[PDB]
Amino acid sequence: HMATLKVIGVGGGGNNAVNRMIDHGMNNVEFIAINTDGQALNLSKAESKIQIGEKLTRGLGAGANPEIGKKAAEESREQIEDAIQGADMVFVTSGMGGGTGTGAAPVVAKIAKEMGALTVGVVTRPFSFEGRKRQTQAAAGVEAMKAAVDTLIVIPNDRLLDIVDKSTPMMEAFKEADNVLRQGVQSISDLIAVSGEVNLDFADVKTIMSNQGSALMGIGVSSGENRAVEAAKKAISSPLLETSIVGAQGVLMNITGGESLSLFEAQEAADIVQDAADEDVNMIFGTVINPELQDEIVVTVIATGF
Ligand SMILES: Nc1nc2c(ncn2[C@@H]2O[C@H](COP(=O)(O)OP(=O)(O)O)[C@@H](O)[C@H]2O)c(=O)[nH]1
Ligand SMILES: [Ca+2]
């Protein structure tokens, strides 16, 4: 069994994320670009493109009206089903607050789930400087997304203001937001690709991610003294995420290391997760020994059940 992973960008922000991921290089993942904006879709690098709402917009964006994105997606339902068909997992990514993302992304998520895919949303909330109407349409979209998906990761754009200095280029800040999706996707590809010593597979991802609500995905890398504890802390850190580790009741944790990976280190990492949660966590634990590695340890966490 080799699970089919698809990433679907919906609207401007969603498609920017897809474009920056394709640009960065990513294999065994199919990308789908969905938009009302024909100008933007023409410049997309995605292998499969769906223009929605040509009747409604005549190839322009939806102009900040979420009912137009919704109706656009509904009328292109069969084209969307066809593009998804055969996926085992779908990541739907979108910026909430606009017309197309806000309205179309939950429809896409709903179609994905009813095609049988494990469906994860990764969405942004607008910057506060964008104003209250934007924030309020965004919140309606987030609730709609939450209803449609299996699990939802929310990245408030205001959090980007916590990781920049006064000169950090906007595109560099956006790339940091993109990493949440990219590394979440990559960590699932990696789990599926490798047969670990204590193996985790797609059915374990399904157990943790299916019909939950909020989620956290994370990866942390470290080496040398305290590598396991530091990799675990990095894995659970959530500066850009609305949903932190606290209150997590289920965690999929994988530790990858060289032949030096110690049992003691494995427990240290697991206990960082347990203790940061402040709940009695139901852990799905895995380990991979990759003899090509020297002193590096990688800890992967997916946490749900808040
Ligand atoms: N982090 C991030 N946020 C974005 C990006 N593009 C747009 N946004 C945000 O997403 C919201 C909706 O924008 P957009 O997706 O272009 O609207 P739509 O195409 O009408 O859905 C904006 O109000 C911004 O908060 C991006 O590339 N990165
Ligand atoms: Ca595996």
Swiss-Prot record:
It comes from the Bacteria. The keyword GTP-binding applies. The chain holds residues 12 to 315 of 390 of the full protein. GO terms for molecular function: GTP binding; GTPase activity. GO terms for cellular component: cell division site; cytoplasm. It comes from Staphylococcus aureus (strain MRSA252). It is found in: Cytoplasm. Essential cell division protein that forms a contractile ring structure (Z ring) at the future cell division site. The regulation of the ring assembly controls the timing and the location of cell division. One of the functions of the FtsZ ring is to recruit other cell division proteins to the septum to produce a new cell wall between the dividing cells. Binds GTP and shows GTPase activity. GTP binds at G12, G13, G14, N15, N16, G99, T100, G101, E130, R134, D178. This is Cell division protein FtsZ. Keywords: Cell cycle, Cell division, Cytoplasm, GTP-binding, Nucleotide-binding, Septation. Belongs to the FtsZ family. Homodimer. Polymerizes to form a dynamic ring structure in a strictly GTP-dependent manner. Interacts directly with several other division proteins.
